[PDB]
């Protein structure tokens, strides 16, 4: 049975856009803009986009489209780098362990929004402490913050990551709904997902447009917009902003998960993935910018309502999404409709990205093992059920701490290392000239010198710098006033290293399993598997300087 192809170009484009434009653009990007001075974050973010993220989005799409394999088996062109595919699959699994819990939060809030009196508008609820107060009629004791932290997370019942408690049953039911939706959107291949993304990948844009248009008019929104567009240039001398920008670029665009490779693996050969990558990157960046505009307008609005400064209303984590925006909504007229549309948009943003992240794992491992390829429904069930079981940790009472650890270490330094290894393996060992020849065979034109330079020198160099500084400039993990114990940081670094070490481990395994002399093993490892008949003939390009001097 030959590999099937997307029913339409719109199927592929909507899948790629739904995965790329994700909950990150609304939950992670605006908080990173506030956390890093506002407009100072945008300069590293745009720079990293241009020089690493667009180039590597294009590289992943072209690799998948030409080799027609998943992230793991795509490394038949350079057999030593299959550990990179395994690492990106593992990163995708790690990220889905908590991304679906965020989707479950969105679903819980949506079900809570089916009321004329939103539960986060006032105190007097079973989840409210005796300190609850509405400052617009200290911020942690507001109706919305207390709702999020006690009636949803039940975080008040957890002292820390050492005492996380048992899974919350309402959040467990919402997670069950999310995983069932994912399974039935993924169990029959990419056709069902490509048709499903027609609404999930399009509704968020209308919702976000209305949110932006309304927020820009709210009183005090101008102060938030000014803070958003204010550039603190001394913050660019800190490595934290650059690490955050690079990690956000690769977490939000979707490079380093194996999703783009898996999606392009179902493309027709002549599909223009260059323009697809350009369009998806531009849409992701404009969505991030518009979501940040709306979030900061709401920050200014709430700072005006509270008669406080914008830095006294912003909250770490998913606070800007689940405390600030719900509070502003509750302050509006027709607040029920605003809440319903906001959380439907959040669900639509998260669901297609979870589908893409799970498709990365399913496609990669089914291409790696054909038994899994035949049993698509059973393997999809296995992936979804494993994600559910390991996401149970993030719906516990102290599940926010596990979620913070995961969102810090699953796709932080690890994803940057994975994309760096992708770029190196494709542009140095396989050959940037060979990759350009492949792209010419698909598209008739070779990628411009800008893209080749980014693939071989610029993106690898910036990625290496960001990885090294992220390791060097790591700060102990914290959530609000809670300081994670020293062993939580070691556990998080172990989670990151778990995916990072698959690359050296696979290189060692491939070298040892291969039979022959040292040079024969090296040639087999760096030679494409379909060309392994040349190792005997001793015609390895990588053993000559012209291969390595390809600009």
């Amino acid at each position: 049975q030959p590999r099937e192809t997307w029913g339409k170009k719109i199927d592929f484009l909507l899948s790629v856009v739904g995965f790329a434009v994700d909950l990150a653009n609304v939950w992670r990007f605006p908080y990173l803009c506030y956390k890093n001075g506002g407009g100072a974050f945008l300069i590293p973010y745009t720079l990293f986009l241009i020089i690493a993220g667009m180039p590597l989005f294009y590289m992943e799409l072209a690799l998948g489209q030409y080799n027609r394999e998943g992230a793991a088996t795509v490394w038949k062109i350079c057999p030593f780098f299959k550990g990179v595919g395994y690492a990106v699959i593992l990163i995708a699994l790690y990220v889905g362990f908590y991304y679906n819990v965020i989707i479950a939060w969105s679903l819980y809030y949506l079900f809570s929004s089916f009321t004329l009196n939103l539960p986060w508008t006032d105190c007097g609820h079973t989840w409210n402490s005796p300190n609850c107060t509405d400052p617009k009629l200290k911020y942690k004791f507001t109706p919305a913050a207390e709702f999020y932290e006690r009636g949803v997370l039940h975080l008040h019942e957890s002292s820390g990551i050492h005492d996380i408690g048992l899974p919350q049953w309402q959040l467990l039911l919402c997670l069950m709904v999310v995983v069932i939706v994912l399974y039935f959107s993924l169990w029959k291949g990419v056709k069902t997902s490509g048709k499903v993304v027609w609404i999930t990948a399009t509704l968020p844009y209308f919702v976000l447009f209305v949110l932006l248009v309304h927020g820009v008019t709210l009183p005090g929104a101008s102060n938030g917009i000014n803070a958003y567009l204010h550039i603190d240039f001394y913050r660019l001398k800190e490595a934290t902003v650059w690490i955050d920008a690079a990690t956000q670029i690769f977490f939000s665009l979707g490079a380093g998960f194996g999703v783009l490779i898996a999606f392009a693996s179902y493309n027709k050969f002549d599909n223009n993935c260059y323009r697809d990558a350009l369009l998806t990157s531009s849409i992701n960046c404009i969505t991030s910018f518009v979501s940040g505009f709306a979030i900061f307008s709401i920050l200014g609005y709430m700072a005006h309502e509270h008669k406080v400064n914008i830095e006294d209303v912003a909250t770490e984590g998913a606070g800007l999404v689940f405390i600030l925006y719900p509070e502003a909504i509750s302050t509006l007229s027709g607040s029920t409709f605003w809440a319903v549309v906001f959380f439907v948009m959040l669900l639509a943003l998260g669901l297609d990205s979870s589908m893409g992240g799970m498709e990365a794992v399913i496609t990669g491992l089914a291409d790696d093992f054909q038994v899994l390829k035949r049993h698509r429904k059973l393997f999809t069930f296995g992936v979804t059920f494993s994600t559910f079981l390991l996401a149970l940790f993030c719906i516990t009472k102290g599940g926010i701490y596990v979620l913070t650890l995961l969102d810090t270490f699953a796709a932080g330094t690890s994803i940057l290392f994975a994309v760096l290894m992708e770029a190196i393996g494709v542009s140095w060992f396989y050959g940037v000239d060979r990759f350009s020849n492949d792209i010419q065979q698909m598209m008739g034109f070779r990628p411009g010198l800008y893209w080749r330079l980014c693939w071989k020198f610029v993106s690898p160099a910036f990625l290496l710098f960001v990885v090294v500084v992220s390791i060097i400039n790591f700060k102990p993990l914290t959530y609000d006033d809670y300081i994670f114990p020293p062993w939580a940081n070691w556990v998080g670094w172990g989670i990151a290293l778990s995916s990072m070490v698959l690359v050296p481990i696979y290189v060692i395994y491939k070298f040892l399993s291969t039979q022959g002399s040292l040079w024969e093993r090296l040639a087999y490892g760096i030679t494409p598997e379909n060309e392994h008949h040349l190792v005997a003939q001793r015609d390895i390009r990588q053993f000559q300087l012209q291969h390595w001097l390809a600009i």
Partner: nanobody
Framework: VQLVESGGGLVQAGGSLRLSCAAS????????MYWYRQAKEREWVAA???????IYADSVKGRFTISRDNSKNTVYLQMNSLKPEDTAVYYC??????????????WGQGTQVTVS
């Protein structure tokens, strides 16, 4: 899905040769039809793609001309101004039949071309 190549033969340098690729089991007029040659490794020669766009390898551009007949389900490669370096076994390949199809990557048996 089957590809049967023909038209190969011994030709003089600077001559012309028209290879045919009789296709079965799929319509070539929606298909990504590629020509390869193995003198060395199989090197992509030309492609007439799902929407009729013709692309050529730099080694054959301006000399070879790929075309497809919709009535006969045949893909043609008009190789002109042939050189001794064009001597190889030319393979006709169908990457896929476009969108809503399967990635066949089916290859023909090859057709020898010898440029004296």
């Amino acid at each position: 899905v089957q590809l049967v190549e023909s038209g190969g033969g011994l030709v003089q340098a600077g001559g012309s040769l028209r290879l045919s690729c009789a296709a079965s089991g799929f319509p070539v007029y929606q298909a990504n039809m590629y020509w390869y040659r193995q003198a060395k490794e199989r090197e992509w020669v030309a492609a007439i793609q799902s929407e009729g766009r013709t692309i050529y390898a730099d080694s054959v551009k301006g000399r070879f001309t790929i075309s497809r007949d919709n009535s006969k389900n045949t893909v043609y490669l008009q190789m002109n101004s042939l050189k001794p370096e064009d001597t190889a076994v030319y393979y006709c390949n169908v990457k896929d039949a476009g969108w809503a199809s399967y990635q066949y990557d089916y290859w023909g048996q090859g057709t020898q071309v010898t440029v004296s």
